[PDB]
């Protein structure tokens, strides 16, 4: 998909265990296994992706 | 820049706009009790001792940092102000220690003077018999400045002076809540040509 | 009628909601949350048009929506956003979306991130246009590391799809969203303190004036706005300010989430119309008090920071920003903490005070110690060792603290003890009485 | 006994006045020699704004609170 | 026991070498740039987070490292690194059990779970085993008041708990086996127990309830 998922690193483990945590999965109704699939370093890995897109920052000092 | 007209204590007063309430009250002549405010330091609201009531005030305002606005009415010595000041000093004097006789600022201490003028005279703090007060380890800071931080009131005069006037930048605050302390997180010496002036700034004998 | 002035409502029975009217449909996560389901549930619909409308449009329909900010203070957002919309300066205007859920008893904020992060992002975009925001920052507790990543993921899908960024939704206007996971501390839920957090300073709040509309992050014009306040916004601009006035009774307009917890059979979060009786709600979406309605000692409607109300006064309470104010309590976050007839309310409240004592930056004279004092007094009361005059200390100390502190936290610490003395003083008298007799 | 002996009578002598011209008038009438010491010029207003603590460009941004 | 004054201990001292590993170095470069050029000091808290996350706790050398990155006095980093609660300035350990012992978690019995935790780990509050596998801790509220009682372990949210399951959870973590976070009583996410009473209808779809004009 053109709107891909975040980088494979940012994803703790590729969902293959289906039921995760309290019983989330792409099948079952509580469809948010992605929440329970976040790594110790998932946050930082996200911004590593986001070097690509973000626009120029304002600068006070000229 | 035309000067605003404001009735400080039922007296018309002239202030260039943006003037702070306190800076106007001195202009006329009245003085508000301050602890964290000094002429030559950045403005902060810490002590809450400079509070004052303005007619139709939902909230008493800190004169030290309150820019005056048109047609106000500042009631310096109105009972609501007196209620506020006493409460604030009951607070300050909860857990200040009982060390006036051994405190080098005895008889020169703003806390004593402003306690006399504007504070109460009875101790509602009953917990001295149950769990006592708080205490803080003193710091080693140099061969010049003797430090007894268990008297500090966290006015941040030392913090602001060092950061700005001397630019040492090595003296600051730490921690939340009643356990907030001041000093350097690790033992250092506050070495600086102007370091003496902190002794005059600290209103209390810390 | 003028551009503002939301239309008064003429309904008496503000009963349940219709799930069509529930804006947060995915709440409880029965359906997909990624951008596939989101655009299947209508999460980015005609955003290009609405954004193009301008700021005058958006602010106006907000005004006639009469929305009161759900951040706990309750001041309406239309005026807030309008202040941002004042040009005549070369500043990088910013928009801060406070997602702090520090408020004890409150859990609604968490699930918006966990189940509809796209909705919030869309809302920030529409609002950010109305605030002329150069960019925005979604400040979030450090206790929600998994949510923060989840939001980061939603930002990924949005950036990749081109919904948000430069030329977002093809409108040409630029807007980027960043995620700042502040190292958890309850005080950061304050506007000024949060701004200090983002800036990297100590974290303690600031005096007002100046307001964030004057100077905010980086000394730039900003507003801190609650997550729900933002999340509803795009739906309002997409569904009609008239319709949102269709709910609510008066100035307390719109709908709000509720978090029912405590001695409750089936506590949970419920989207439901405001201006509702509390008893009806507790028996509709909640199942009722564990010991039945009679076995009820008191409810704290706004969660912590809010005085308790006893069962008798509670029996007929209209839940809303108003109404409760008359009943001597503030709706806060609509966080209802309910306790059965049998539990130590006094040491329940003592726990709240300890929370404040541990959660108070310590910049103001009253709050750096006065809560510390209240903690000492309440602890002694809980153990039953205190002269009855300490009833008056707590009453009279509380008045001294309230109003003199900088951030509203002091008031949040002052009110609960005031409520306890007003309504459950006989309990304290008995607790002290038992100790004295044994003494 | 190592006290601070002083055989000079007008050592502690100290009097107050409302304005220097009054004092000079008094001092002459009692035939003393004197020399005024100009106190100070009127305090020049200092802006002492709160917002300067938080500025985007100016150096005056506070390092801490 | 928490101290806002640091002494040069053998285990915590600037002499210890800390440095950002190449993986984190990239992240540091990427994260710095979300702040305008003038004010880079705002990134400090994320940087301290990353350092703690890499190391497991904050050594004073790490605070120096962040200060060196941002070119500011070492005291300012100390100020913040001491303010925020979870910036553990002492050796934490592998797992950091956090129990929210405030209302309404206290109301739902969360004293029980804390009592058991001390029993089985063998140490009291604010403590860590000689192993450092475990660290008991109390926190005010973890934003899961609704799923009360509840515990968190360094990322995790274990809610809807009791003495029985905490015993099981600790035996699991004693064995060092992965545990499934989230509630373990039948619900999943802040949803009323049993059958559902609201949002029982399919989401309408895009455009529903549009203004129909403007
Ligand atoms: C001590 C304290 C804690 C606060 N915590 C929160 C919070 O956790 N979540 C929130 O949305 N607002 C919180 N607020 C209020 C926010 O600072 C601010 O009022 C809110 O964003 C208002 O937004 P709104 O009026 O548009 O809804 C807190 C205020 C104080 C004084
Ligand atoms: S600082 Fe003032 S009040 Fe405190 S011990 Fe010294 S003289 Fe007494
Ligand atoms: S040490 Fe002195 S100057 Fe510094 S905050 Fe304390 S009382 Fe104020
Ligand atoms: S009221 Fe309390 S928490 Fe708020 S700024 Fe003052 S001391 Fe800090
Ligand atoms: S002088 Fe105003 S708060 Fe201290
Ligand atoms: S006190 Fe347990 S999550 Fe709030």
Curated annotation (Swiss-Prot), chain B:
One of its GO terms (biological process) is reactive oxygen species metabolic process. Disulfide bonds: none annotated. GO terms for cellular component: mitochondrial inner membrane; respiratory chain complex I. Keywords: 2Fe-2S, 4Fe-4S, Electron transport, Iron, Iron-sulfur, Membrane, Metal-binding, Mitochondrion, Mitochondrion inner membrane, NAD, Oxidoreductase, Respiratory chain, Transit peptide, Translocase, Transport, Ubiquinone. One of its GO terms (molecular function) is metal ion binding. [2Fe-2S] cluster binds at residues 36, 47, 50, 64. [4Fe-4S] cluster 2 binds at residues 152, 155, 158, 202. [4Fe-4S] cluster 1 binds at residues 96, 100, 103, 109. Residues 80-119 form the 4Fe-4S His(Cys)3-ligated-type domain. Its main location: mitochondrion. It is found in: Mitochondrion inner membrane. Residues 2-80 form the 2Fe-2S ferredoxin-type domain. Belongs to the complex I 75 kDa subunit family. Complex I is composed of about 45 different subunits. Core subunit of the mitochondrial membrane respiratory chain NADH dehydrogenase (Complex I) that is believed to belong to the minimal assembly required for catalysis. Complex I functions in the transfer of electrons from NADH to the respiratory chain. The immediate electron acceptor for the enzyme is believed to be ubiquinone. This is the largest subunit of complex I and it is a component of the iron-sulfur (IP) fragment of the enzyme. It may form part of the active site crevice where NADH is oxidized. This is NADH-ubiquinone oxidoreductase 75 kDa subunit, mitochondrial. It comes from Drosophila melanogaster (Fruit fly). The gene is ND-75. The chain holds residues 39 to 244 of 731 of the full protein.
Curated annotation (Swiss-Prot), chain D:
The modification Phosphoserine is found at residue 63. Disruption phenotype: RNAi-mediated knockdown results in mitochondrial membrane respiratory chain NADH dehydrogenase (Complex I) deficiency. Mitochondria in the flight muscle shows a wide range of structural abnormalities including dispersed cristae, onion-like swirling membranes, swollen mitochondria, sparse matrix and irregular cristae densities. Eclosion rate is reduced, locomotion and feeding are severely impaired and lifespan shortened. In the brain, there is a pericerebral fat body deficit. It is found in: Mitochondrion inner membrane. Accessory subunit of the mitochondrial membrane respiratory chain NADH dehydrogenase (Complex I), that is believed not to be involved in catalysis. Complex I functions in the transfer of electrons from NADH to the respiratory chain. The immediate electron acceptor for the enzyme is believed to be ubiquinone. Belongs to the complex I NDUFS4 subunit family. This is NADH dehydrogenase [ubiquinone] iron-sulfur protein 4, mitochondrial.
């Amino acid at each position: 998909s053109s709107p891909s998922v975040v980088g494979l690193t940012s994803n703790c483990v590729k969902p293959s265990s289906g039921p995760v945590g309290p019983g989330a999965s792409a099948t079952g109704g509580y469809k948010v296994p992605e929440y329970y699939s976040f790594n110790r370093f998932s946050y930082a890995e996200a911004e590593v992706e986001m070097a690509k897109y973000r626009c120029p920052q304002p600068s006070a000092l000229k | 820049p035309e000067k605003i007209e404001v009735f400080v204590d039922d007296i018309p007063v002239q202030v260039v706009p943006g003037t702070t309430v306190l800076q106007a009250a001195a202009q006329i002549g009245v003085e508000i009790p301050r602890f964290c405010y000094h002429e030559r330091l950045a403005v902060a609201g810490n002590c809450r001792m400079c509070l004052v009531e303005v007619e139709k005030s939902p909230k008493p305002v800190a004169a030290c940092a309150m820019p005056v606005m048109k047609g106000w009415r500042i009631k310096t010595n109105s009972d609501l102000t007196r209620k506020a000041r006493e409460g604030v000093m009951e607070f300050l004097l909860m857990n200040h220690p009982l060390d006036c006789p051994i405190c080098d600022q005895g008889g020169e201490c703003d806390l004593q003077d402003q306690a006399m003028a504007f504070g109460s005279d009875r101790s509602r703090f009953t917990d001295i018999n149950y769990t006592g007060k708080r205490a803080v380890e003193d710091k080693d800071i140099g061969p010049l400045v003797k430090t007894i931080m268990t008297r500090c009131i966290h006015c941040t005069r030392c913090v602001r002076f060092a950061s700005e006037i001397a630019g040492v930048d090595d003296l600051g605050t730490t921690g939340r809540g009643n356990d907030m302390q001041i000093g350097t997180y690790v033992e250092k010496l506050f070495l600086t040509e102007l370091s003496g002036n902190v002794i005059d700034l600290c209103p209390v004998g810390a | 009628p003028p551009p503002g002035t939301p239309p008064p409502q003429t309904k008496t029975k503000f009963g349940p909601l219709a799930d069509e009217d529930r804006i947060f449909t995915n709440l409880y996560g029965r359906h997909d949350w990624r951008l596939k389901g989101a655009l299947k549930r209508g999460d980015w619909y005609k955003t290009k048009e609405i954004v193009l409308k301008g700021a005058d449009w958006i602010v106006n329909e907000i005004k006639t929506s009469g929305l009161r900010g759900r951040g706990g203070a309750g001041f309406p957002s239309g005026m807030k956003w309008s202040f941002m919309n004042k040009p005549g300066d070369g500043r990088p205007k910013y928009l801060v979306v406070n997602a702090d859920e520090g408020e004890p008893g409150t859990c609604k904020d968490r699930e918006i991130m966990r189940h509809d992060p796209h909705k919030l992002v869309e809302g920030c975009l529409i609002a950010g246009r109305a605030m002329g925001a150069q960019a925005a920052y979604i400040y979030i507790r450090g206790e929600f590391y998994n949510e923060a990543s989840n939001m980061q993921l939603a930002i990924a899908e949005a950036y990749q799809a081109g919904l948000i960024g430069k030329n977002a939704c093809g409108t040409g206007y630029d807007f980027d969203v960043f995620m700042h996971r502040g190292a958890g501390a309850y005080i950061c839920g304050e506007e000024t303190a949060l701004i200090e957090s983002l800036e990297g300073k100590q974290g303690k709040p600031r005096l007002k004036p100046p307001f964030p509309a004057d100077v905010g992050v980086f000394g730039c014009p900003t507003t801190v706005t609650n997550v729900e306040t933002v999340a509803v916004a795009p739906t309002i601009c997409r569904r009609g300010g008239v319709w949102f006035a269709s709910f609510g009774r008066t100035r307390n307009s719109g709908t709000k989430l509720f978090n029912i917890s405590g001695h409750v059979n089936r506590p949970c979060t419920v989207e439901e119309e405001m201006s509702i009786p509390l008893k009806e709600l507790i028996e509709r979406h909640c199942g009722g008090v564990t010991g039945g309605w009679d076995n009820l000692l008191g409810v704290i409607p706004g969660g912590s920071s809010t005085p308790i109300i006893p069962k008798n006064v509670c029996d007929d309470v209209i839940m809303d920003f108003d109404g409760l104010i008359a009943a001597q309590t503030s709706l806060g976050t609509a966080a209802i903490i309910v306790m059965d007839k049998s539990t130590d309310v006094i040491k329940a409240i003592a726990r709240l005070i300890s929370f404040y004592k541990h959660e108070s930056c310590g910049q103001c004279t009253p709050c750096r110690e006065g809560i510390g004092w209240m903690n000492k007094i309440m602890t002694r009361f809980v153990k039953g060792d205190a002269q009855p005059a300490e009833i008056d200390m707590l009453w009279e100390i509380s008045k001294q603290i309230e109003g003199h502190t900088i951030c509203a936290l002091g008031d949040g610490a002052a009110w609960p003890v005031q409520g306890l003395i007003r309504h459950f003083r006989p309990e304290i008298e008995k607790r002290m009485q038992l100790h004295a007799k044994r003494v | 006994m190592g006290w601070a002996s002083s055989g000079d009578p007008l050592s502690n002598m100290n009097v107050q006045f409302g304005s220097p011209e009054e004092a000079i008038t008094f001092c002459e009438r009692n035939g003393w020699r004197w020399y005024v010491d100009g106190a100070a010029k009127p305090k020049k207003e200092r802006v002492k704004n709160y917002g300067i603590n938080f500025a985007w460009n100016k150096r005056t941004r506070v390092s801490t609170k | 026991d928490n101290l806002f004054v640091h002494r040069d201990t053998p285990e915590d001292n600037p002499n210890i070498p800390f440095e950002f590993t190449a993986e984190n170095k990239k992240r540091v470069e990427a994260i710095l740039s979300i702040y305008p050029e003038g004010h880079k000091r705002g990134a400090m808290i994320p940087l301290l987070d990353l350092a703690q996350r890499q190391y497991g706790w904050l050594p004073i050398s790490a605070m120096h490292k962040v200060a060196e990155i941002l070119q500011l006095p070492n005291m300012r980093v100390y100020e913040v690194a001491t303010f925020y609660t979870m910036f553990m300035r002492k050796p934490t350990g592998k797992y950091h059990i956090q129990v929210c012992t405030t209302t309404p978690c206290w109301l739902r019995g969360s004293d029980d779970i804390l009592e058991t935790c001390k029993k089985q780990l063998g140490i009291g509050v604010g403590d860590t085993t000689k192993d450092r596998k475990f660290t008991i801790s109390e926190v005010e509220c973890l934003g899961a008041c609704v799923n009360a009682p509840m515990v968190a372990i360094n990322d995790d949210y274990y809610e809807d708990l009791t003495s029985k399951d905490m015993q099981d959870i600790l035996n699991d973590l004693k064995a060092d086996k992965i545990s499934p976070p989230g509630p373990r009583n039948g619900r999943f996410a802040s949803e009323p127990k049993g059958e559902p009473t609201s949002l029982s209808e399919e989401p309408k779809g895009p455009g529903f309830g549009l203004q129909a004009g403007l």
